[PDB]
Amino acid sequence: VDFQRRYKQFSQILKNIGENEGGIDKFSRGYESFGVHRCADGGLYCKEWAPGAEGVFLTGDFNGWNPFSYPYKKLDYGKWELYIPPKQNKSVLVPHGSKLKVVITSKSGEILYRISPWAKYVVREGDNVNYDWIHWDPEHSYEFKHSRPKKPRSLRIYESHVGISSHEGKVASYKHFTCNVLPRIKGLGYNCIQLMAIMEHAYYASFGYQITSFFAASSRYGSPEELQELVDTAHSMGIIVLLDVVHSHASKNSADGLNMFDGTDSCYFHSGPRGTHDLWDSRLFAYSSWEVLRFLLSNIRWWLEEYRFDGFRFDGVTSMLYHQVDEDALTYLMLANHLVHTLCPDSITIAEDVSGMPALCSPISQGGGGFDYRLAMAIPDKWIQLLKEFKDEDWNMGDIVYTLTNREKCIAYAESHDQALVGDKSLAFWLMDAEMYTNMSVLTPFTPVIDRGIQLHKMIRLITHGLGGEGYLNFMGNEFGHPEWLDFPRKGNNESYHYARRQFHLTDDDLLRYKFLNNFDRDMNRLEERYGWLAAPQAYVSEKHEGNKIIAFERAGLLFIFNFHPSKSYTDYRVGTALPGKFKIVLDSDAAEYGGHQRLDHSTDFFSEAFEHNGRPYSLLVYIPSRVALILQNVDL
Numbered sequence: 001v002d003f004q005r006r007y008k009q010f011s012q013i014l015k016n017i018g019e020n021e022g023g024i025d026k027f028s029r030g031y032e033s034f035g036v037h038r039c040a041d042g043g044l045y046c047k048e049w050a051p052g053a054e055g056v057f058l059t060g061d062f063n064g065w066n067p068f069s070y071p072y073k074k075l076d077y078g079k080w081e082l083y084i085p086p087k088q089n090k091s092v093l094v095p096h097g098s099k100l101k102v103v104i105t106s107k108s109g110e111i112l113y114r115i116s117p118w119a120k121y122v123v124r125e126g127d128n129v130n131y132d133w134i135h136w137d138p139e140h141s142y143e144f145k146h147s148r149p150k151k152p153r154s155l156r157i158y159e160s161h162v163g164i165s166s167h168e169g170k171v172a173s174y175k176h177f178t179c180n181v182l183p184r185i186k187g188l189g190y191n192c193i194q195l196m197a198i199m200e201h202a203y204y205a206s207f208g209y210q211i212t213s214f215f216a217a218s219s220r221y222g223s224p225e226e227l228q229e230l231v232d233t234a235h236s237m238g239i240i241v242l243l244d245v246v247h248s249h250a251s252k253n254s255a256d257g258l259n260m261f262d263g264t265d266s267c268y269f270h271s272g273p274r275g276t277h278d279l280w281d282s283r284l285f286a287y288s289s290w291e292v293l294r295f296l297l298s299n300i301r302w303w304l305e306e307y308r309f310d311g312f313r314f315d316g317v318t319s320m321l322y323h324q325v326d327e328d329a330l331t332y333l334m335l336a337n338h339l340v341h342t343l344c345p346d347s348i349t350i351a352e353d354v355s356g357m358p359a360l361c362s363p364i365s366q367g368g369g370g371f372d373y374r375l376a377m378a379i380p381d382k383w384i385q386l387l388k389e390f391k392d393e394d395w396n397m398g399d400i401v402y403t404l405t406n407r408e409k410c411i412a413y414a415e416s417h418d419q420a421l422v423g424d425k426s427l428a429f430w431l432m433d434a435e436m437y438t439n440m441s442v443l444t445p446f447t448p449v450i451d452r453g454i455q456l457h458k459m460i461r462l463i464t465h466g467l468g469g470e471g472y473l474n475f476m477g478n479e480f481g482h483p484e485w486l487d488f489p490r491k492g493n494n495e496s497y498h499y500a501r502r503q504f505h506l507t508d509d510d511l512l513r514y515k516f517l518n519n520f521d522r523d524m525n526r527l528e529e530r531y532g533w534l535a536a537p538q539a540y541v542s543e544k545h546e547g548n549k550i551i552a553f554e555r556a557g558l559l560f561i562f563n564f565h566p567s568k569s570y571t572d573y574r575v576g577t578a579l580p581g582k583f584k585i586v587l588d589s590d591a592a593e594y595g596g597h598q599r600l601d602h603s604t605d606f607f608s609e610a611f612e613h614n615g616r617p618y619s620l621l622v623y624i625p626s627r628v629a630l631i632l633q634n635v636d637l
């Protein structure tokens with residue numbers, strides 16, 4: 001790790017992009033010439049990079065699948081271009097909705113049929129083994145009607161998957177998400193959507209991590225225009241949309257994927273074993289290769305320009321960095337971040353990194369990776385440890401406080417999307433187990449295990465939200481403690497969609513207790529919008545009492561008190577504060593609307609006195625019941 005090196009290297013490649021291409025703007029507009037394009041003159045212009053092809057051709061429905069009638073002309077640097085002249089009758093050469101294929105001929109004599117790396121749209125017809133390359137030329141394009149929202153003060157991310165966003169056991173649509181799921185997200189107080197599994201993946205059960213077509217918005221959920229309408233509608237509501245970018249590896253599919261494009265093992269990827277990820281059975285990009293930079297950077301630009309995304313989450317950053325560290329992978333990520341922020345400084349980039357790479361989330365100008373945030377991955381693990389291995393009486397308050405406050409800006413989350421999956425437990429499941437199925441009805445008794453589960457689900461989320469980071473993340477359903485698990489159709493379940501859905505109706509059912517966990521989430525995010533603790537400096541922790549099981553801190557002027565004690569309810573408990581005067585309850589997890597016992601009267605005025613307590617100048621006395629969290633705001637006398 002030499003920061004002077006990381007910059008000098010980046011600075012050089014960027015300088016070359018300027019001398020060789022016309023700067024990173026021009027360089028990242030590769031999607032404008034590569035692929036298949038209909039010209040204003042009625043002709044068709046095509047361009048590809050196939051360095052190890054003897055010949056390249058265009059075939060499809062349009063030419064009665066004659067493989068060699070349209071040969072591309074070879075250019076320098078292993079690139080090929082084709083211009084089919086316009087029709088005499090002045091009609092479309094390649095009709096919209098029709099099938100296409102690139103024909104690659106090898107030195108040996110193999111005749112290979114490929115989908116262009118640059119393909120905009122791909123569809124799997126009924127029960128076909130492979131995806132077909134569908135030419136996209138609609139009568140009307142989607143015109144974006146709304147402007148990008150003002151950059152949020154603090155991010156409150158709602159991690160979403162479009163397919164599973166309905167109560168039905170089927171792939172839900174972009175249209176369904178736009179009409180039914182966007183208003184729910186807005187209502188909860190979330191100001192950002194992390195859109196998962198958008199980049200085309202042939203294997204649905206890969207959760208969007210096995211990419212086949214990099215420039216293609218998954219056909220599965222609908223047309224490219226319906227995704228544009230989705231993003232535009234989110235903007236109409238003041239919600240920013242970020243995309244999950246998988247540039248770490250590629251699916252090894254060759255018929256309908258990026259693998260073996262020009263017939264060799266070294267096109268967009270590394271030759272031999274270096275180019276194969278053994279654990280994932282995937283291909284690995286040759287980040288040193290100029291054309292891989294054009295491809296990957298024109299992809300970043302594509303999602304910014306075509307679909308108007310407000311930023312990205314770069315997945316598999318750890319795997320990219322360690323093949324010792326891959327300098328090329330890292331210089332690619334620096335150029336990607338440089339591009340995103342040069343085009344729009346308000347744009348956000350997040351890194352999915354477990355390693356904790358020094359300066360990954362710091363400015364490039366200081367030898368950093370250029371990322372705005374990293375995910376605070378230690379937080380979900382600490383909650384798992386405590387619920388799996390420790391009795392409530394044995395939870396260390398100092399260890400909770402340490403894990404949450406360790407730090408570079410990070411995104412805090414109580415549980416990941418991976419924890420929602422089959423053969424893993426959600427926080428709601430770790431807390432209530434089999435009782436989740438029995439006593440989540442208002443009509444059944446409020447058992448001590450349902451009572452404990454509800455109280456702790458709220459508290460774990462609130463301490464993660466208030467103390468854990470500079471941003472917050474919640475995966476679809478976990479805001480109301482969604483039951484069961486998530487599982488995608490695959491071999492191992494005989495293609496079942498029974499768990500490939502989200503039961504959102506559970507919160508609308510007044511005869512169920514999910515409404516309580518949902519109400520808490522809505523009010524937690526709305527209170528954050530009002531006071532901005534996520535944007536505030538790190539909290540001042542006055543108390544992390546091992547005996548009493550009390551965590552007390554101040555962030556953005558608010559006073560946060562947590563009683564994790566399984567049985568003791570403290571009266572006249574002294575909490576230190578930096579502010580004198582009157583204090584009022586702004587949030588109480590024991591309120592009835594959240595599934596509490598209503599033990600506290602909110603109309604009570606708490607008066608700060610001049611009594612040094614826990615390194616705080618003033619202190620106030622409070623009633624904090626067992627498994628209750630409180631937020632107190634200082635008010636004008």
Ligand SMILES: OC[C@H]1O[C@H](O[C@H]2[C@H](O)[C@@H](O)[C@@H](O[C@H]3[C@H](O)[C@@H](O)[C@@H](O[C@H]4[C@H](O)[C@@H](O)[C@@H](O[C@H]5[C@H](O)[C@@H](O)[C@@H](O[C@H]6[C@H](O)[C@@H](O)[C@@H](O[C@H]7[C@H](O)[C@@H](O)[C@@H](O)O[C@@H]7CO)O[C@@H]6CO)O[C@@H]5CO)O[C@@H]4CO)O[C@@H]3CO)O[C@@H]2CO)[C@H](O)[C@@H](O)[C@@H]1O
Pocket residue numbers: 019020021050051052053075076077078290291
């Ligand atoms: O007249 C006085 C003047 O004379 C000299 O300079 C001459 C040059 O000698 C002459 O060639 C020309 O150079 C221009 C050139 O015409 C311009 O186009 C431009 O070149 C840029 C280019 O536009 C950029 O794109 C960039 O090129 C990349 C390329 O895009 C990228 O794909 C990659 O290419 C590699 C490829 O991907 C690989 O697959 C492989 O290619 C293989 C094929 O796979 C294989 O199938 C087969 O076809 O062979 C190929 C080659 O082995 O390798 C490729 C790389 O080798 O990388 C390149 C990066 O190089 O950059 C170029 C360069 O900037 O600009 C140049 C000028 O810089 O005109 C000038 C004069 O006008 C003399 O040198 C000078 O001092 C005198 O003043």
